[PDB]
Amino acid sequence: TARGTPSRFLASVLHNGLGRYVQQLQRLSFSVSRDGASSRGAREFVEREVIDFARRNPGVVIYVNSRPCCVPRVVAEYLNGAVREESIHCKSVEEISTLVQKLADQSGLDVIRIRKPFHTDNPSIQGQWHPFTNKPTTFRGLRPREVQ
Amino acid sequence: ISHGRVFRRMGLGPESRIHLLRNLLTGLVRHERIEAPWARVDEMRGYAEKLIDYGKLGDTNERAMRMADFWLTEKDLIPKLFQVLAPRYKDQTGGYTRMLQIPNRSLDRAKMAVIEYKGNCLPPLPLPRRDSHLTLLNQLLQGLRQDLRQSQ
């Protein structure tokens, strides 16, 4: 629920698309058990999908190890320091590919209510409204019901 | 409404009130100092004063003798009243008893009070003195004593 949940404003890491786009995900750790039944989709992903993903994303360092011994997991680390874990136990190779792409396609901010859908740093060009725009002025700057 | 009623209400009625105060007064005449609940002592102080007043008239008077017969229960004390207390206060015309408040009672946390007949033999109660005459405020007031006396 909104009231019962944090929130943030719409933002980017380092003005990402301004100069040059940079890919925020920088490290991806796969733990895949060589024997466990829950590590089957993970084993398929590593055997026939991780090389292609590594080639398509050369800014991400992908480590894979075989010592959880019962449960797999993927831990994604980002430029801005954020970590994000996702379960891949008992999932299909399609699901794991979709998930890993999702991880590589987002900035490491928090997935919480974005208050505004548009963030602008220079919201005004003609000058933000104040009660004296569109209001006349009178001779010598007199207030109403003055004399001098 | 209780406007202008000077007598406390205690005991099981008026009579028990007189009897309670009578026992307190007898204890006071026998020992010359007793610790009792504060309100009861404050009620008994007037009676002890007037008892000394009646005792000054002396044995020969019969009204005083009847009164001291009622208000003293162990009669060995009636001699004392007429031969040790009343003679002792031949000078004072009032205020024969001093009444203080003391630490509340341990059990029922009642307001206590020690009451005694002035001049007895007992070790003296720790009365509270006033501030020494040599304290700063008193010294300034003494200077004002002098300076006002000379002017007048």
Binding site: - | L134, L136, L137, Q139, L140, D147
Partner: protein, 287 residues
Amino acid sequence: SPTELTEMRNDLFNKEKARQLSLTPRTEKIEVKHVGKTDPGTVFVMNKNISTPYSCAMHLSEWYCRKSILALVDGQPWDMYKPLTKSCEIKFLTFKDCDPGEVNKAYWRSCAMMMGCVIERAFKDEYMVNLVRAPEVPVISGAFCYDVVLDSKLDEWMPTKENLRSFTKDAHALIYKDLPFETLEVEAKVALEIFQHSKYKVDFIEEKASQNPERIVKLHRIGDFIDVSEGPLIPRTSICFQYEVSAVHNLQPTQPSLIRRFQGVSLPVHLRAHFTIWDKLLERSRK
């Protein structure tokens, strides 16, 4: 340029204070026996030249610290903040003892020093104020006096009541600030080798110790202020609660200069005096 004269005093004051405090050879111990009817027969074990009588008072109870106003060691008054020096005997003097003589004297000379630290900065910098002395007067007199000399340009200026009100407000600011009365034992040469600005207290400085066999003198410091007095002072300026400088006097033999004299009267927080009694006391602080 008085605003640098204060610094020129305080820097050397702190210098001597530090050089004295650094003479202690690795925290030696002294024994202070306590005498008096209250809590008698205790033996404090203190530090030879760090612990003060307060360091002893706090050992006993907050009551002793709150009520104590001066300390007898070897049966002579000894300020509360002044460090001890040797295995001694101690007792604490308050305002409500039977004989508050020494305490009253200390209180009134402390009030004199406070009035000094108030008057000196009271005037416009273009004038030149020079503190003469704190003439010791008995408490019975009716007010404490402080002799100062104003610059000759003010002969036609007898202070008006409003300016006395300003003096009182400033003194109340000083007490409200709650500064302590630090003390310092110093060889008499500071007054003869540095303090050239001593023009009228140049007389007092020999009165410090020329009379006594030793060649050491006492300095008292409120804080960014220094002055000598003839005895111990009360520990904090908060002790005073009611305070007022009433009027001023002049001494007729006006050959050297106009020796203005300032009168004031005060009481501690303990011995507060009711409003009307205080008015009566003030009326007599004008003699």
